[PDB]
Scaffold this active site. Structure first.
Site, short mmCIF file in Angstrom:
data_model
loop_
_atom_site.label_atom_id
_atom_site.label_comp_id
_atom_site.label_asym_id
_atom_site.label_seq_id
_atom_site.Cartn_x
_atom_site.Cartn_y
_atom_site.Cartn_z
N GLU A 119 0.81 -1.20 0.00
CA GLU A 119 0.00 0.00 0.00
C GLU A 119 0.86 1.28 0.00
O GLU A 119 1.89 1.34 0.69
CB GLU A 119 -0.92 -0.09 1.19
CG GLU A 119 -1.60 1.18 1.66
CD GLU A 119 -2.04 1.00 3.08
OE1 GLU A 119 -3.25 1.16 3.36
OE2 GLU A 119 -1.15 0.63 3.90
N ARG B 84 -4.04 -4.29 1.73
CA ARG B 84 -5.30 -3.56 1.82
C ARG B 84 -5.93 -3.33 0.42
O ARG B 84 -5.46 -3.89 -0.58
CB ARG B 84 -5.14 -2.25 2.58
CG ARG B 84 -4.62 -2.39 4.01
CD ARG B 84 -4.95 -1.12 4.77
NE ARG B 84 -4.96 -1.32 6.23
CZ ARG B 84 -4.09 -0.77 7.08
NH1 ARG B 84 -3.16 0.07 6.65
NH2 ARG B 84 -4.18 -1.06 8.37
C1 LIG Z 1 0.93 6.60 8.27
C2 LIG Z 1 -0.02 7.07 9.37
C3 LIG Z 1 -1.30 7.50 8.71
C4 LIG Z 1 -2.24 8.05 9.79
S1 LIG Z 1 -1.91 9.28 10.71
C5 LIG Z 1 -3.35 9.26 11.53
C6 LIG Z 1 -3.71 10.10 12.53
C7 LIG Z 1 -2.80 11.06 12.99
C8 LIG Z 1 -3.12 11.92 14.05
C9 LIG Z 1 -4.36 11.84 14.66
C10 LIG Z 1 -5.29 10.89 14.23
O1 LIG Z 1 -6.48 10.86 14.91
C11 LIG Z 1 -7.63 10.06 14.51
C12 LIG Z 1 -8.60 9.94 15.70
N1 LIG Z 1 -9.51 8.77 15.61
S2 LIG Z 1 -9.68 7.85 17.15
C13 LIG Z 1 -8.36 8.23 18.29
O2 LIG Z 1 -9.65 6.36 16.82
O3 LIG Z 1 -11.02 8.18 17.82
C14 LIG Z 1 -4.97 10.02 13.16
N2 LIG Z 1 -4.07 8.25 11.05
C15 LIG Z 1 -3.44 7.59 10.08
C16 LIG Z 1 -4.07 6.43 9.33
S3 LIG Z 1 -5.01 7.10 7.90
C17 LIG Z 1 -4.76 5.87 6.64
N3 LIG Z 1 -5.58 5.83 5.58
C18 LIG Z 1 -5.43 4.90 4.61
N4 LIG Z 1 -6.26 4.89 3.56
C19 LIG Z 1 -4.41 3.96 4.70
C20 LIG Z 1 -3.59 4.04 5.83
N5 LIG Z 1 -2.60 3.17 5.98
N6 LIG Z 1 -3.79 4.98 6.76
#
Ligand SMILES: CCCc1sc(-c2cccc(OCCNS(C)(=O)=O)c2)nc1CSc1nc(N)cc(N)n1
Ligand SMILES: CCCc1sc(-c2cccc(OCCNS(C)(=O)=O)c2)nc1CSc1nc(N)cc(N)n1
Ligand SMILES: O=c1ccn([C@@H]2O[C@H](COP(=O)(O)OP(=O)(O)O)[C@@H](O)[C@H]2O)c(=O)[nH]1
Ligand SMILES: O=c1ccn([C@@H]2O[C@H](COP(=O)(O)OP(=O)(O)O)[C@@H](O)[C@H]2O)c(=O)[nH]1
Lengths: 228, 229
Positions: free
Chosen positions: B34, B97
């Protein structure tokens, strides 16, 4: 077997009017209207929201707005190739603005006015570049530049009757006009789609109110089309 | 004609560890890691940036990161399907994925924790439908292999994956990501904008028990799964 002709021209140049006039004048002739003019139903409720935010806060919302606008344009123009002109003799569809004015006038403008940082801009560009390389389909058989001074174009902006638009500067239009003159008249503008260096263009002075008198325009329109 | 198989699960549950092992057993199997994983070319700069930009301010960059992550996947998966595996006799493409991971796991969680607003999520869904159906048709899956693991294993593994800008990436987040896989892949609560997926086979592997030197029972299960296809 349908010829595709984009009608280009600064905000308020006279496009929606000219393209409508032209619709009435033949059965081989069909338009695709501008969706953000439709915004200006799932898509309406969404464009409706983003355009309002576009106004309320442009540096938060420009990327989001350019991407949807383009998506909706492409979607709307494909729907037109199916729904019309399967039968007709010399079919013509008049696109109101193009995917190319989405990128090289408006989004570009927004970048230059710092409403998109470089990552947003190179992401949009990637997004645009890849998507339209998948499709000859929407590719333009020709262009008609509907040229109107910002003097003309501010003078025209007032009348239409839209709460959301009434405030728009003139200097703005001088960037778009400039962006329009460079691409379509002075013919300098670089683009990554090579055939835009060689698509037949027609520049029509849309300065005079052409609502009560348009035959001369249409003759060049008709004369232009007999060449493509 | 090539089989397309999606490998699904939680951040640092081992989808790369598994996928990295399967590619090496067979001439006829290849791997499509991915987009995001690689982000930790102009898509590289674009991706690193949008990634860090999103860490600081998910509420500002979720729509952007999300749209960029999934276009980049549709692109990568299409290139392999029309490039790779030239004359394999029994051809399997394992995806790290899929575009349902993107939307129904990651886009949903971000919308539902208010990093995307209502308009952001509704545009996303509108684009997502259409990006797949103009361009993503021949990415249709024949099955999903689900690495099912409890939510705790992963944090440890992020400390093992060393990734510093997720050094202490919250526990509570993993736990959230964890409940949407179950619904999607274990119960089938999460019905989607996609017709064929309802009747699509799913292999489920409990991968709590470490396996990087003991993957043969797990690899036996996959071969069985591939034959029912
Ligand atoms: C490489 C890290 C990518 C990040 S950073 C990140 C993030 C960063 C800071 C805060 C954040 O807060 C989300 C809060 N949701 S919660 C704590 O479960 O209620 C998320 N989520 C992600 C996952 S988003 C994502 N979307 C995709 N389509 C694929 C993938 N591998 N990741
Ligand atoms: C005329 C109605 C649609 C709107 S609203 C709008 C707008 C709203 C708020 C601020 C703004 O300017 C951005 C900041 N530049 S500035 C005035 O030098 O500081 C533009 N631009 C536009 C034109 S951009 C555009 N892009 C398209 N792709 C298509 C299309 N019809 N229009
Ligand atoms: O020669 C013209 C062209 C347009 N209009 C009016 O000015 C408003 C907006 O112009 P138009 O929609 O043509 O501009 P566009 O956005 O289509 O370039 C509309 O109410 C038109 O009826 C006009 O009075 N004379
Ligand atoms: O059976 C396993 C599965 C995972 N890991 C460790 O967990 C970390 C993250 O796994 P991976 O990068 O494969 O996770 P993904 O996000 O791709 O699921 C790596 O450092 C692996 O060494 C392990 O040691 N044994």
């Amino acid at each position: 077997r349908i010829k595709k002709i984009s009608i280009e021209g600064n905000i308020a140049a006279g496009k929606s009017t000219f393209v409508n006039i032209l619709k009435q004048l033949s059965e081989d002739w069909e338009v695709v209207p501008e969706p953000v003019a439709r915004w200006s139903t799932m898509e309406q409720k969404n464009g409706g929201n983003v355009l309002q935010m576009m106004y309320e806060k442009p540096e938060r919302w420009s990327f989001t707005f350019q991407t949807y606008a383009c998506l909706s344009r492409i979607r709307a123009q494909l729907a037109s190739l199916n729904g019309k002109l399967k039968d007709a003799e010399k079919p013509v569809l008049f696109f109101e603005r193009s995917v190319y004015s989405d990128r090289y006038i408006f989004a570009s403008n927004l970048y230059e006015s710092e409403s998109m940082n470089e990552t947003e801009w190179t992401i949009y560009q990637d997004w645009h570049d890849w998507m339209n390389n998948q499709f000859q389909s929407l590719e333009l058989d020709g262009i008609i530049y509907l040229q109107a001074t910002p003097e003309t174009c501010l003078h025209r902006i007032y009348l239409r009757g839209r709460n959301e638009e009434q405030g728009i500067p003139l200097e703005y239009l001088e960037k778009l006009h400039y962006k329009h003159e460079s691409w379509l008249l002075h013919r300098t503008l670089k683009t990554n789609f090579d055939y835009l260096q060689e698509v037949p263009i027609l520049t029509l002075d849309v300065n005079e109110d052409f609502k009560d008198k348009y035959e001369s325009l249409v003759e060049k329109v008709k004369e232009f089309l007999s060449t493509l």
